[PDB]
Design a protein around this ligand. Structure first.
Ligand code: HEM
Ligand code: HEM
Ligand SMILES: Cc1cc(N)nc(COC[C@H]2C[C@H](OCc3cc(C)cc(N)n3)CN2)c1
Ligand SMILES: Cc1cc(N)nc(COC[C@H]2C[C@H](OCc3cc(C)cc(N)n3)CN2)c1
Ligand SMILES: C[C@H](O)[C@H](O)[C@H]1CNc2nc(N)[nH]c(=O)c2N1
Ligand SMILES: C[C@H](O)[C@H](O)[C@H]1CNc2nc(N)[nH]c(=O)c2N1
Ligand SMILES: [Gd]
Ligand SMILES: [Gd]
Ligand SMILES: [Zn+2]
Lengths: 402, 401
């Protein structure tokens, strides 16, 4: 009845029984698989709330207690009287951690139980959002000894617009579109760059200009806030044996902080809830720096390495990409900023899968996202079959607010 | 119709071909199982008609006299015999379509170029061996590899199937050691032991070519030795690392899959071995570096003087790249056809474009199409794909033992 899941390296087999509890539908059908696609009332709120409250009381081993029953009744009553309900602080903490644990595209989930949760549900203005965000960044960065964290802004509520952070991450480099169609800086950020400019930002003209934040309080247009440079820790990139590499003037920032996803807990929705961890080196060295549609540095690095770029069979692309990844790891370690390589990260994810099989009888995982973008089959996750499904609490994509 | 996006270029297509998917896959709206390796006259006539209609459409003769005549011919045969026979032209079309339809094959730009050998008259395992040797000779062509398939008689009621027991025509022996380890290729321990059970005298090397176990209908399989002159191999050397050659690594020229079933118009061919040429990552990354295959990555890293005591030195990645370099260099030096993963994936992108115009889409399995090293350095990583089953097709089937 349950999907049989094999590891091909070791030959071990498990059944994913957790998948039977999937709470929402994905995009696949028996006729065709769409797994590779990036982006494919009171009664329902009450059912989701009860399920969540049940999750919480199981988690602390107090299922069936007087406390468990009291909370179920209180939530049902609150929904009946007000159309919604409020989480207790302990439930919010549990819910944020479960959403991380449930995230099928995250390879760093061995860390799921260690998350600092900042409660910003009393926030009242964009100015105050900025205060909460600056404190999050300071805490999470911790002078380079990075700590995972999430700040939760007020939930969606009838009669009131949402809190939103327009930027996709708290730290993003500007992308300035040029006349020929080319881009100076990060091509991923052309749209948000133009929005900042539309909203009164005086642009720079470098390749690594840190963008301001556009923060939206309910029923207000977004407001522009500049991050203090002392707050945004960055790492200049150099290579331990290719001395010219430093002359490329590349850098990246310490803190990956996703700020445009929706956090869903017990039927409640938090459209502003930025979360941060630390980088896996391939995100920077392979994707951000080597994607043709990002900084696209591969050929210039290969030429400086004096590789033969005239034919593909010399594997110049592969050689240059490996050395760029070496530079990222070396540079972050030199700067004493937490980073994890893809071998260490995937090994820890295998341990997570093992832990979760025992704890819950399975683990939702998106193979295409878990396997790293270089050296895929050299990592244990390549050889591991995975089952992808949606559990709640969850982090979800949402439409851009403009 | 699914909207399909390329993230490198931002281009969008719609796969209208997927709406024609015959067979169901393993996914449901509740959970995706896309990463898993292995998830009556009336029915036969329905598949036969669909196939005949497909063929006549392909040659621009739908509704012609010839089309209606063929449909009547097939109906009469099934009514009389319970089955039917393909014309040779239909067999060729069907085999090419099965390749074209294979979602896991990155080499499909070549689909229209396939030599089809008709061995449907085959009677004995001895004759099966002769056909197989002729296939190997033609396909190998002194290193200038040519894609080919040999089709043995179709499955029929009250008669056993022809089967090739070996998973490929060329396989290296895997010998179980007393401590439980393997000498040679661990992928082939089972078939090696079966060969031994059937009277093969084993060697004790790391690259011993296995004999063939060939099964004629209702007979036990018979052992056949491939003449060594028929099996082209390439010793591996590296262009700049002079010690690499001393490792004594080698691989064979011809990837020839022999355990899959070919399905065409409801007819089933349980023995229909097919061959092309290698993409270098198959040998250099998977066959030589998989921990459950030859597992030589750390040996190479030792020889390269790499720091194997921290993962962050990326010693694994560096050793793997040089092994792939050695494969490409060695095959090119030996004048044996090979394609690197960059060239192959670029040609596949061209194939997707051709198929969008021709058929309105292309079934493709992303996890298999993206190469096992340097995935995102290839264009296919950034291409969304839709996976579904079309017929004619190559299918997995149970081992005959
Ligand atoms: C602690 C170290 C962490 C590491 C090493 C890590 C690693 C990763 C990586 C490599 C990705 C793929 C990102 C991409 O390719 O764009 C990812 C995605 C993701 N991570 Fe983690 N992560 C960490 C912490 C966290 C935390 C603290 C959370 C939430 C509380 C989280 C939730 C997610 C989610 C929801 C995604 C999917 C994002 C998307 O779909 O665009 N991660 N993570
Ligand atoms: C001509 C050059 C060819 C190249 C470069 C090529 C490339 C590949 C590669 C890299 C794979 C993945 C195999 C693996 O990872 O084990 C594959 C699979 C496959 N190929 Fe092709 N191929 C070629 C020719 C052919 C031909 C002639 C046929 C059939 C007529 C074919 C049918 C298939 C099928 C059915 C699979 C899936 C096998 C499976 O599921 O195990 N290929 N091909
Ligand atoms: C928490 C965390 C830790 C860590 N090591 N890495 C991350 C990176 O997450 C970045 C997430 C955000 C984008 O998703 C949204 C998005 C938007 C667009 C326009 C394209 C796209 N592919 N994806 C891509 N990956 C997040
Ligand atoms: C025709 C052809 C051309 C080319 N370049 N490469 C090939 C390689 O096909 C080899 C086939 C044998 C395995 O069959 C699937 C399989 C079988 C088994 C027992 C395990 C596994 N993980 N995967 C994987 N691909 C075939
Ligand atoms: C089309 C394909 O799904 C897309 O390129 C995915 C592939 N896997 C990925 N995996 C991760 N971790 N991050 C990504 O952005 C992507 N992109
Ligand atoms: C579990 C996973 O599906 C399995 O390891 C797949 C991944 N992708 C692959 N891709 C190819 N081309 N060949 C393979 O054998 C595999 N193995
Ligand atoms: Gd140097
Ligand atoms: Gd030495
Ligand atoms: Zn699927």
């Amino acid at each position: 009845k349950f999907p049989r899941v094999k590891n091909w390296e070791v030959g071990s087999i498990t059944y994913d029984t957790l998948s039977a509890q999937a709470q929402q539908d994905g995009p696949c059908t028996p006729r065709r698989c769409l797994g590779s696609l990036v982006f494919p009332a009171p009664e329902q709120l009450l059912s989701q709330a009860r399920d969540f409250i049940n999750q919480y009381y199981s988690s602390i081993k107090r299922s069936g207690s007087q406390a468990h029953e009291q909370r179920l009744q209180e939530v049902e009553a609150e929904v009946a009287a007000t159309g919604t309900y409020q989480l207790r602080e302990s439930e919010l903490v549990f819910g944020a951690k479960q959403a991380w644990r449930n995230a099928p595209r995250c390879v760093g989930r061995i860390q799921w139980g260690k998350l600092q949760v900042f409660d910003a549900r009393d926030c009242r203005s964009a100015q105050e959002m900025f205060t909460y965000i600056c404190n999050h960044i300071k805490y999470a960065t911790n002078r380079g000894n990075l700590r995972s964290a999430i700040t939760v802004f007020p939930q969606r509520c009838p009669g009131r617009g949402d809190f939103r952070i327009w930027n996709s991450q708290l730290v993003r480099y500007a992308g300035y579109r040029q006349q020929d169609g080319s881009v100076r800086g990060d091509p991923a950020n052309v749209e948000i760059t133009e929005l900042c400019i539309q909203h009164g930002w005086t642009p720079g003209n470098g390749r690594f200009d840190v963008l301001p934040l556009l923060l939206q309080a309910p029923d207000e247009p977004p407001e522009l806030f500049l991050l203090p440079p002392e707050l945004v820790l960055e790492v200049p990139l150099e290579h331990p044996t290719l001395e010219w590499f430093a002359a490329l003037g590349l850098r990246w920032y310490a803190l990956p902080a996703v700020s445009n996803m929706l956090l869903e807990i017990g039927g409640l929705e938090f459209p502003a809830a930025p979360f941060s961890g630390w980088y896996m080196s391939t995100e920077i060295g392979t994707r951000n720096l080597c994607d043709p549609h990002r900084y696209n540095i591969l050929e210039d690095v290969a030429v400086c390495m004096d590789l033969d770029t005239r034919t593909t069979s010399s594997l110049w692309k592969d050689k240059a990409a490996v050395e760029i990844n070496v530079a990222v790891l070396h540079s972050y370690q030199l700067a004493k900023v937490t980073i994890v390589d893809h071998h260490a990260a995937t090994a820890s994810f295998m341990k997570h899968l093992e832990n979760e099989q025992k704890a819950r009888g399975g683990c939702p995982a998106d193979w295409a996202w878990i396997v790293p973008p270089i050296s895929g089959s050299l990592t244990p996750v390549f050889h591991q079959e995975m089952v992808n499904y949606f559990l709640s609490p969850a982090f979800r994509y949402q439409p851009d607010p403009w």
